[PDB]
């Protein structure tokens, strides 16, 4: 049983995506609760969200064997991690977000299109910042 190419690999990727989203959703729901004055609910959402952090990171540790779910590249060492982050970010600013901006604009969603453009620019800033840190890495 090599994990590479298994159904179990795809499941880990799927479950990693889901738990990642669960954390983000629960933190969003926490902020709603905050404003409403529902402090016990807010606290429960934050606590559950820590749970989903442990789940997501557990999945990701198994995926170390086959590569970063976002890029397929090796990860583990800071060098590799930075390298994979740069590749993923580069894809987001040169392909994904501009593509999404154009589709939005084409469908008449002008505010969302400008949002995707804002984020294309931020991801380019992220890629460049990580490239600078990689250049300076002494390992």
CB of 88 to a second copy, least distance (A): 7
> Considering only residues 50, 107, 114, 121, which one is a binding residue for a second copy as defined by CB under 8 A?
107
Maximum Cα–Cα distance for the chain, whole Å? Answer: 51
Binding-site positions read 19, 52, 55, 89, 123, 126
The C-alpha atoms of residue 90 and residue 30 are separated, in whole angstroms, by 32
26 contact choice in a second copy, Fe ion, none (CB below 5 to 8 Å, kind-dependent): a second copy
Q: Which residues contact 88 (CB under 8 A, 6 or more apart)?
A: 68, 70, 71
The interface with a second copy within residues 9-68 (CB under 8 A) comprises: 11-12, 15-29, 31-33, 36, 38, 40-41, 44-45, 48, 51, 53, 55-58, 60, 62, 68
73 contact choice in Fe ion, a second copy, none (CB below 5 to 8 Å, kind-dependent): none
The C-alpha atoms of residue 134 and residue 139 are separated, in whole angstroms, by 10
Say if CB 97 and CB 120 are below 8 A apart. yes
Binding-site positions for Mn(2+) read 19, 52, 55, 89, 123, 126
How many residues bind to a second copy according to rule CB under 8 A? Answer: 73
CA atoms within 13 A on the CB side of 21: 6
């Amino acid at each position: 049983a090599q994990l590479k190419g298994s159904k179990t690999e795809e499941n880990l990727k799927y479950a990693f995506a889901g738990e990642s989203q669960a954390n983000r959703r629960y933190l969003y729901f926490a902020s709603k609760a905050d404003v409403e004055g529902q402090n016990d609910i807010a606290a429960l959402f934050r606590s559950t969200a820590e749970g989903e952090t442990g789940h997501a990171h557990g999945h990701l540790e198994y995926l170390e064997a086959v590569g970063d779910p976002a890029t397929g590249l090796p990860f583990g060492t800071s060098r590799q991690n930075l390298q994979s982050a740069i590749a993923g970010e580069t894809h987001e600013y040169t392909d994904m977000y501009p593509g999404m901006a154009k589709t939005a604009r084409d469908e008449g969603f002008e505010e969302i299109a400008n949002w995707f453009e804002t984020l294309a620019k931020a991801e380019r800033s992220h890629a460049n910042r990580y490239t600078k840190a990689l250049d300076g890495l002494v390992d």
